[PDB]
């Protein structure tokens, strides 16, 4: 459950 | 997949889109720090091992009779919560429903900006009520002072001397630079007798990106190498929304996030403080 | 699976994932050098017959029943160890297994990055423990001075004479240039009177990578041509991790790989030295 | 396929590939010169015929009766063999199957390095023992001075003058250029005030591969035009690896090649000669 | 037995 | 059955 | 081997029973030195640990947790070859082949006699090309001076000094003793009014033999402690014979043997240096 990773 | 709300579930996940679509546009802290997986709800503390000493390998022969390891110095941390709340009115939600206009959530995208900038201070200057150290507040951080950044070409000179203090303590590889908005404007000058832009003349040596964040002050700057073993962003929940009920007659909400910044090896950070004093 | 293995099998491959992924982004030695066959456990010595001259003859009619061969210069080498160790704690493994998160390995990558730097320091300088000659200390290696590698376009002009000295010794083909990070910035200026970058004038002239290795001094660089029967890397064992006996209550470890470079023909190297001291 | 050998049929084919991989990488004679058919071993002498500025045509209306052909001046050449021999040792070959390592073959590439280099020394300078002339020894070859094209823009100006001297004798077609390495490195500067290297303006004026070779010692260079009706070399047997029994518990070998060069029209060669006097 | 094998 | 012919 | 060599499989052993039985009369090298195993043909290089330090055992009721070991200082050697070749005769082999008498190999006993003396040249002085140290050339080897080895009873006095010089370094056990043929022709003799044979007073202290080797050409000798734990020689291939070819019309052969001696503790050798200069 990961929502917002950019890099 | 939602129990009860004044929104359709087909409409509710449009709100989860725009709360992360206007969040990754703003974030610069997660740009070069490989964070973690999730941690679930049942974890309110994290451990980090401040190593503070590192050395090379050995190559002699068939082996030895001991395990030469570094020190650990285990420190316990706690996980804060960063939040911001917004309100979504009745009589505009009702008015958009009667004559079928798609509802605007442009308060929520404004709300996830402020929770992604309040997150960006604790990753640089660090908290105080939980005393989590920032990226410019740790002990043993290899400081470096400079001055007069814009005369001819000594901008590029001023950081090769900065990485040499970071290279002699056995830290190399992919680097990263974060500069304040005052320093980033000065780095777009044209180079004398190189005849290329000074920012492009330095982006092949740092090799994983220069950045610009408004969380810093005026004359400042931080160069740190990336990867794990040096930096970590242990996380427990990402940007989730939550209903709060029908208090009064309108509908409020709350976005929230739970992060910490654990620094493992503090000797692999540098600091371009740049004073005149 | 041979040992008693405090880790199970499905996450033991995550250690072999991390220890070889963090090694790939740091290994510049074998990015242009041909690689020998894995000799296995049963060989712990190697030789190389150093050739240095020409010995051209036999332009006559049929027959001439004789035999004439060349000079050997045989020497034997011993394969070194190149190990580095680390440690995993219990009561941190059982915690990651209880609430079911995947285990961290942010200390195995520091062990993998450490061995892959001493393995790169050995190949470019040689070891005095076993008299293995490095890539800059080998005998008869065609040195060449530099003379102000800074400005106006005598940087690309200085490569062509260094390319020329390999050409007179009947050596050509795919060259490969490895030079220091402080000199790699000097191939970024525009070439005079043509307004093209100088590194585009030399990527057509070397035909392999113009690399950049951090294990070097200031003004220094080396140009060599690749291939087998010129120089290669005798390998015996790749990056395998070994489980030491769980002493006390914790679980230590050790990564290791045994490798040695052998130079077959030392005339096919050229070294940019710049002796200005 | 063999009569008999101390090797394996799958392995003796690998020796034949090491000797022709390291041949194509070396010689420059057979790159711009058309080949003759493989005559086998039945031929032992070849016949060529010099022509030297032949006759004219007719412009009649109805024809004529007698046939008028030009002169031949047949000279009979003889075919030599060029070779160099190498040995595979008794101890090292027998050890490589006791612990299952594929055999080294770096001696064979060092032997094909020789016999291909001596093959260029025969074509560019001629063998006195058999009296066959080279490309710088032939009788009547349009010599032309170079006038020290060193630093100015007379590099392009001088080899367009050689192409003019050869064009006024009705020799059009794709010329080729072979230069000394002292001159080939000199040709890589920028053309004067016209933003291109000299080597790109030249290669459209020649269009069949300006080459180089170290067999030209001083400052020199030849320029020919190709064509099978003008200049070709007669092959009879290419690089085969013979076997010579065994003397002293060792296994010798021999690589060999039989070829002559027959020039037909000597007014197609032009020679840059460098009077430094 | 290989496992780095960089070009 | 020729050995090596380059263009 | 058998490439249809002109000897059957049955009378090839009579060539080996002549070599292996005429060699062991002449060999005083391996009469007090323990053999290492047959290393085979996967081995060309051996290691040996030069200890040069000692310790002692312990005595208690239960075991101790710690572990005590020594230092090694590994040195690598190569394995030289030793050959000498003979030649049989057609019209002399063909007599015994056609008359069915046993073919003589009396030349082979003379050939194998020389390679035994060349072994004792190596095992007592060390090959200088492969730098392996001899039994008289090793470093740290307990010198001792002698005087006037001719008078009545001046030998057993002069040999009890060298034992006690070696006994204080805690090396007590069965000592061997090799003497130059001048000394062995001077130890037991006839005297003036003393009539002591002077060897039965020395045979009891020594109890591993007093030999006589002609390699020590001056007048000197050594006292060595025996044992596998102290020094041993390594065989890669024992006394073998082979068949070269058929040069002319006769048959040559070659005896050969690959031996290197490695010392482990050089402080258990005492050399009678003989001041005579």
Author numbering:
A (entry chain E), E (entry chain F), F (entry chain G): 3 to 9
B (entry chain B), C (entry chain C), D (entry chain D), G (entry chain A): 6 to 282
Provide passages from the article that reported this PDB entry.
Here, we report the structural and mechanistic characterization of the IMEF-system found in Quasibacillus thermotolerans (Qs), an organism that does not encode any ferritins in its genome. We show that this encapsulin-based system self-assembles into a thermostable 42 nm 9.6 MDa protein compartment with a novel T = 4 topology able to mineralize and store an exceptionally large quantity of iron. In contrast to ferritin systems, IMEF encapsulins are two-component systems with the catalytic activity separated from the protein shell.
Through single-particle cryo-EM analysis, we determined the structure of the Qs IMEF encapsulin shell at an overall resolution of 3.85 Å. The IMEF encapsulin self-assembles into a 240-subunit icosahedral compartment with a diameter of 42 nm. The icosahedral asymmetric unit consists of one pentameric and three hexameric monomers. Strong TP density is observed for all 180 monomers that are part of 2-fold symmetrical hexameric capsomers while substantially weaker density is found for TPs bound to the 60 pentameric monomers thus revealing higher occupancy and preferential TP binding around 2-fold symmetry axes which can be explained by different binding site conformations and higher local shell mobility. The TP residues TVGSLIQ were tentatively built and refined into the additional density present at hexameric capsomers producing a model with good geometry.
